[PDB]
């Protein structure tokens, strides 16, 4: 699609020279500096701000463009949960009842890598999507236990888990990467097409451009 040659020199400017701690955006209590933002360069490994932001621009675009109840979790959520049980995750979300939503995204970060677990409340099922090839079973089973015991101790209502399903995401379906740097995009781009019930249809060839675009959509916060 688009390429405003001028909107382009607004990019080379934020992936440019000068301050490394120089702010260039702000929102949902996050400040993307010329340091964070630079992880979006070619072959560069993305951070947790760059991701924790484009993951919040998603909520805004679903709410103002008429899309599903989009609740997103911090990239630091799963880890703290894989170690500190629900109890040390309890109050996390008090400013919100979850089942009240439809879709829930969770940025799974396994040191040096990024995957995604998509919880579809509508469908009562979760999905672990991994750009590389990995399968996540133990990764999902943790989340659900978080949930059965989530509502059970926040509404005295358990959760017939017999009603619940989850599963891996075979690689022959969803596009896989062809390197080891561009996983941070596959981890977000999934989180989009998935957030608009749109068929995940994209390839590596496109990504490099998804790269530039993302700094733009992330700068202006004008999610296209």
């Amino acid at each position: 699609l688009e390429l405003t040659e001028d909107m382009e020199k607004e990019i080379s400017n934020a992936l440019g020279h000068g301050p490394q701690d120089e702010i260039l955006s702000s929102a949902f209590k996050l400040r993307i500096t010329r340091g964070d933002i630079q992880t979006l360069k070619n072959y560069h490994w993305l951070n947790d701000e760059v991701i924790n932001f484009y993951m919040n621009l998603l909520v805004e675009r679903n709410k103002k463009q008429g899309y599903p109840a989009l609740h997103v979790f911090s990239t630091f959520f799963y880890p703290k949960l894989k170690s500190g049980g629900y109890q040390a995750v309890k109050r996390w979300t008090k400013g919100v009842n979850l089942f009240e939503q439809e879709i829930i995204l969770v940025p799974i970060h396994r040191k040096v890598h990024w995957s995604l677990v998509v919880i579809d409340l509508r469908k009562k099922c979760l999905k672990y999507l991994d750009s590389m090839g990995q399968k996540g079973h133990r990764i999902c089973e943790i989340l659900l236990q978080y949930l059965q015991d989530e509502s059970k101790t926040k509404r005295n209502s358990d959760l017939n888990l017999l009603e619940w399903t989850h599963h891996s995401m075979k690689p022959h379906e969803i596009p896989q990467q062809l390197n080891g740097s561009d996983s941070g995009m596959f981890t977000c781009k999934y989180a989009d097409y998935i957030s608009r019930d749109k068929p995940i249809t994209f390839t590596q060839h496109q990504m490099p451009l998804f790269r530039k675009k993302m700094v733009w959509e992330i700068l202006h916060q004008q999610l296209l």
């Binding site: 560069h44 490994w45 040096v112 590389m132 090839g133 399968k135 690689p171 080891g180």
Partner: protein, 156 residues
């Protein structure tokens, strides 16, 4: 059977202690319908290689067997495979290599400075050098694997 035992704790002897049916007995007791089992098993089998004729060729035929089986399997994602191999072998992922080089750029220009300065004890000149010489600092691991591989990709 012996095959499931072998797997658990592979071993040159456990491997040879199967006669010629070992080769085909493993590619068969191994579900090639999801590369994670083929990787984990292609690894368990080769974690036995030792230079010795017996254990060497034992391993080869054992792998040529597991590879055919899965190369004629539709559900087999050859891609996810190579890709899951290179990771559990450190040739891919392992570290944010760029960012790293990024954190060295500076410290390496300063330390490379100090050394050349007069105010640097002539003592360390040979300490420092004979220090990035111990194998735990000279022996390069996967950047060796990587090359041995290329060598063959260009075949010879």
């Amino acid at each position: 059977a012996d095959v499931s035992t072998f797997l658990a704790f592979p071993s040159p002897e456990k491997l040879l202690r199967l006669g010629p049916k070992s080769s085909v007995l493993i590619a068969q007791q191994t579900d090639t319908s999801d590369p994670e089992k083929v990787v984990s098993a292609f690894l368990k089998v080769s974690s036995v290689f030792k230079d010795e004729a017996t254990v060497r060729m034992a391993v080869q035929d054992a792998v040529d067997a597991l590879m055919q089986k899965a190369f004629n399997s539709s559900s087999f994602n050859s891609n996810t495979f190579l890709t899951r191999l290179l990771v559990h072998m450190g040739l891919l992922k392992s570290e944010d290599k760029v960012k790293a080089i990024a954190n060295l750029y500076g410290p390496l220009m300063a330390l490379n400075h100090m050394v050349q300065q007069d105010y640097f004890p002539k003592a360390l000149a040979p300490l420092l050098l004979a220090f990035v010489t111990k194998p735990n600092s000279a022996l390069e691991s996967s950047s060796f694997a990587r090359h041995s591989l290329l060598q063959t990709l260009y075949k010879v």
